Point group: C2
Chain length 145, copies 2
């Protein structure tokens, strides 16, 4: 068909290939994976901005996804802090998950804790939490050569 048709077919094929790639990632469980795919659809800037993609991967964690209205905020981590510091929603999350969220914000040069989420995480995270962190960082740096 036409050139637009060729371009559309390739976008479709590419997105199928990316879905296959994501299927091999670490997830804490199948819910985490389902949540992630749902958030990627919701936050359309994820398809081109690795930082948004990574954020979806974290927000998809069932402890976050099920305790936080992730579909109400225009920006992925808008619910985390305001002018008065971290919000009650953020405070309600487990401490190690707070560190993960803070480390994700640190990728964007937004430092919500001192010591930083990265610092605290590197002195405290268990194996599961390390697997999440590693997977998150691999998404963020997907463009690495």
């Amino acid at each position: 068909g036409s050139h637009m048709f060729n371009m559309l077919e390739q976008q479709i094929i590419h997105s199928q290939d990316m879905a296959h790639f994501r299927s091999e990632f670490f997830y804490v469980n199948h819910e985490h994976r389902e949540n992630y795919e749902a958030l990627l659809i919701y936050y359309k800037n994820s398809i081109d901005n690795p930082i948004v993609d990574g954020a979806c991967y974290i927000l998809a964690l069932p402890e976050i996804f099920n305790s936080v209205d992730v579909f109400e905020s225009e920006l992925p981590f808008s619910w985390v802090y305001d002018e008065n510091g971290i919000t009650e929603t953020m405070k309600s999350l487990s401490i190690p998950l707070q560190y993960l969220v803070a480390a994700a914000l640190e990728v964007t040069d937004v430092n919500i804790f001192k010591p930083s989420g990265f610092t605290m995480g590197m002195n405290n995270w268990n194996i599961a939490q390390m697997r999440i962190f590693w997977q998150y960082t691999a998404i963020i740096r997907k463009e690495a050569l």
Copy 2:
């Protein structure tokens, strides 16, 4: 895929036996490996601290190792800064390596750059540098359960 991250989890799970499988770690080349093994002996009286072990792993990188006067560096990162700020040796290193050293220092809540080593690395590191970073983190968190 997930192969390196599976390998790093196995290292942590079995870290009480880590002295026997260091040869299996990710290294950039054989020189990185031999430098690390040597540094672990040189700093042997403090390597029971995972932070010191991880610091040796970074210091072992040939571009760093071959710039550092190891005999004048009390601990593996003493050479990085003094009362006057970051040293000439530190400034002389490629920028992405400076980020790795800074990120490692951030694990001990020593923060020499703004934006942080972790932040800059997460926006810049190539594949080899990500792998160094990941292998470093597995050493640091060898006690994770």
